[PDB]
Scaffold this motif. Structure first.
Motif, short mmCIF file in Angstrom:
data_model
loop_
_atom_site.label_atom_id
_atom_site.label_comp_id
_atom_site.label_asym_id
_atom_site.label_seq_id
_atom_site.Cartn_x
_atom_site.Cartn_y
_atom_site.Cartn_z
N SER A 13 0.78 -1.25 0.00
CA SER A 13 0.00 0.00 0.00
C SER A 13 0.81 1.31 0.00
CB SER A 13 -1.06 0.00 1.11
OG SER A 13 -1.95 1.07 0.91
N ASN A 14 2.16 1.28 -0.06
CA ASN A 14 2.96 2.50 -0.28
C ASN A 14 4.21 2.29 -1.16
OD1 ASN A 14 5.37 2.13 1.75
ND2 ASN A 14 3.57 1.65 2.95
N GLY A 15 4.84 1.11 -1.11
CA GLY A 15 5.94 0.73 -2.00
C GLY A 15 7.34 0.91 -1.40
N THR A 16 7.45 1.26 -0.12
CA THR A 16 8.74 1.41 0.57
C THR A 16 9.48 0.07 0.57
OG1 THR A 16 7.74 3.03 2.08
CG2 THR A 16 9.91 2.25 2.66
N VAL A 17 10.64 -0.01 -0.09
CA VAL A 17 11.46 -1.23 -0.04
C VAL A 17 12.25 -1.26 1.27
CG1 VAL A 17 13.49 -2.42 -1.12
CG2 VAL A 17 11.54 -1.73 -2.48
N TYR A 18 12.30 -2.45 1.85
CA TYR A 18 12.86 -2.73 3.17
C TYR A 18 13.38 -4.17 3.22
CZ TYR A 18 8.83 -5.53 4.87
OH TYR A 18 7.92 -6.52 5.06
N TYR A 19 13.88 -4.63 4.37
CA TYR A 19 14.35 -6.01 4.56
C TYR A 19 13.63 -6.71 5.71
CZ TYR A 19 18.22 -6.29 1.08
OH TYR A 19 18.97 -6.33 -0.05
N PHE A 20 13.49 -8.02 5.56
CA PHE A 20 12.76 -8.95 6.41
C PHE A 20 13.67 -10.13 6.72
CE2 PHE A 20 10.17 -12.92 6.43
CZ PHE A 20 9.18 -12.62 7.37
#
Length: 34
Positions: A13-20
């Motif tokens: 719902s916003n597109g912020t790339v991050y890590y998991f």
């Protein structure tokens, strides 16, 4: 930087790339693959 198991994802719902962390289910905006 941080451990093996941290892998790239995108904040729905916003597109912020991050890590998991696919080994612990943790989440961060810091990319440990560097």
């Amino acid at each position: 930087k941080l451990p093996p198991g941290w892998e790239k994802r995108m904040f729905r719902s916003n597109g912020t790339v991050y890590y998991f962390n696919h080994i612990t289910n943790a989440s961060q905006f810091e990319r440990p693959s560097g």
